[PDB]
């Protein structure tokens, strides 16, 4: 019996990889898949140190100690209290209070940069421990949040908010699968094979 230690972003684990995790479990009954979640920085360190076999992390891929594959396109949605007018540019919500998922620095920085590009700013940023909590604050009328569409639409509360994608250069991010630079192990190759049988559906129309 072997061990495949896979790290993942919270959002990816929630709405992108469940089907692949089940398939891998059933395909390789003698491999123990150990799934952990955390921030990209921490996971990358775990992959580099050998504590993780691979991890789903925020792009872009820049660390020379890693190799990787771009896997999931995420559509970044600005989320507001119910019935709010479509938000198409940051000046329209200048000074608004913002709620961010603490563990995903890349999404927070992206949201901030979107404000700054239109010479606007959030009034303040509140770091939150969960997507459900973040969404509940928006539902309650407290401010705005930036959440991938895939994650947003999986949460019941999406019925109680209004959401729109960010404008083109800010609309899409990419979640990568990364591993330690070098020949892939048989287990990782096996995992990528099962994963690929799905990401054709995710990227294709």
**Contact residues for Na ion, defined by CB under 5 A:** 32, 141, 154
Q: Are 180 and 48 in contact (CB under 8 A)?
A: yes
- Within 8 A by CB and 6+ apart from 66, the residues are 44, 47, 48, 178, 179, 180, 181
For the chain, the residue count is 205
Among residues 82, 113, 123, 127, which is the contact residue for a copy of itself, using CB under 8 A? 82
Which of Na ion, Cl ion, a copy of itself, none binds 60 (CB below 5-8 Å, type-dependent)? Cl ion
| 11 part of the interface to Cl ion, by CB under 5 A | yes
Q: How far is the CB of 102 from a copy of itself (least distance, A)?
A: 11
Q: Are 120 and 94 in contact (CB under 8 A)?
A: yes
Site residues for a copy of itself, 20-49, by CB under 8 A, read 21-22, 24-26, 32-37
Q: Are 87 and 145 in contact (CB under 8 A)?
A: no
Q: What does the binding site for a copy of itself look like in residue numbers (CB under 8 A)?
A: 8, 10, 13-15, 17-19, 21-22, 24-26, 32-37, 81-82, 129-130, 132-133, 135-137, 139-142, 154-157, 159-160
């Amino acid at each position: 019996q072997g061990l495949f230690s896979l790290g993942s972003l919270e959002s990816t684990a929630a709405v992108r990889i469940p089907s692949t995790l089940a398939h891998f479990n059933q395909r390789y009954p003698k491999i123990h898949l150990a799934l952990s979640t955390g921030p990209s920085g921490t996971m990358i360190d775990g992959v580099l140190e050998g504590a993780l076999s691979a991890a789903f992390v925020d792009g872009p891929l820049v660390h020379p100690g890693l190799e990787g594959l771009p896997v999931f396109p995420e559509e970044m949605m600005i989320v507001a209290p119910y019935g709010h007018a479509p938000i198409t540019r940051a000046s329209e919500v200048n000074g608004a209070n913002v709620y961010a998922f603490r563990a995903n620095c890349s999404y927070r920085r992206h949201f901030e940069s979107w404000f700054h590009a239109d010479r606007a700013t959030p009034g303040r940023i509140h770091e939150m421990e969960s997507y459900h909590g973040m969404l509940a604050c928006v539902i309650a009328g407290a401010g705005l949040a930036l959440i991938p569409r895939s994650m947003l639409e999986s949460m019941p509360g999406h019925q109680q908010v209004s959401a729109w994608p960010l404008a083109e250069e800010w609309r899409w991010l990419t979640t990568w699968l990364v591993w330690r630079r070098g020949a892939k192990t048989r287990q990782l190759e096996a995992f990528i094979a099962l994963l690929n049988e799905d990401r054709q559906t995710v990227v294709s129309p």
